Amino acid sequence: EVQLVESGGGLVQPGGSLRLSCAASGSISSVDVMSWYRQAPGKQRELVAFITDRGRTNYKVSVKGRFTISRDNSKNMVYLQMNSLKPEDTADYLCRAESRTSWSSPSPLDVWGRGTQVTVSS
């Protein structure tokens, strides 16, 4: 079972950029979905972006056009490039690996990282 560790968090000015990394302990090329989530104090955890095994991506409406999720299979990495950051993007960002039960993967996969802290503030 893969293990996930996030890095790249920090503080940045509104309008600024950050790049987060989700490092997996092994190949994630076969994982149905790799996701980035975020959670701010007192709020629900929110799905921000995902990339499928086949490379299809989608985005939370509020970040579309300024965030990009991508993957490097040779490095077992998933990245979240964040641009034009707003105070409302402040949160702990966490990655997740999910695969539903299937014939070739009878055991379900649902693994979370511990998170990296993003603060958008002046």
Residue numbers in the entry: 1 to 82, 82A, 82B, 82C, 83 to 100, 100A, 100B, 100C, ...
From the reporting publication:
The trimeric HIV-1 envelope glycoprotein (Env), composed of its receptor binding subunit gp120 and the fusion protein gp41, is the main target for neutralizing antibodies. Because Env gp41 contains highly conserved sequences that are exposed during the conformational changes leading to membrane fusion a considerable effort is underway to target gp41 with a focus on the membrane proximal external region (MPER). Llamas (Lama glama) and other Camelidae produce classical antibodies as well as heavy chain-only antibodies.
Here, we immunized llamas with a gp41-based immunogen and subsequently isolated a small antibody fragment (VHH) that can easily access and recognize the MPER. We determined the three dimensional structure of the VHH and mapped its interaction site to an MPER region that overlaps with the 2F5 epitope. Notably, VHH (variable domain of the heavy chain of a heavy chain only antibody) specific for gp120 with broad neutralizing activity have been successfully produced by immunization before. In conclusion, we have developed an immunogen and a small antibody that may have great potential for development of novel anti-HIV/AIDS vaccines and treatments.
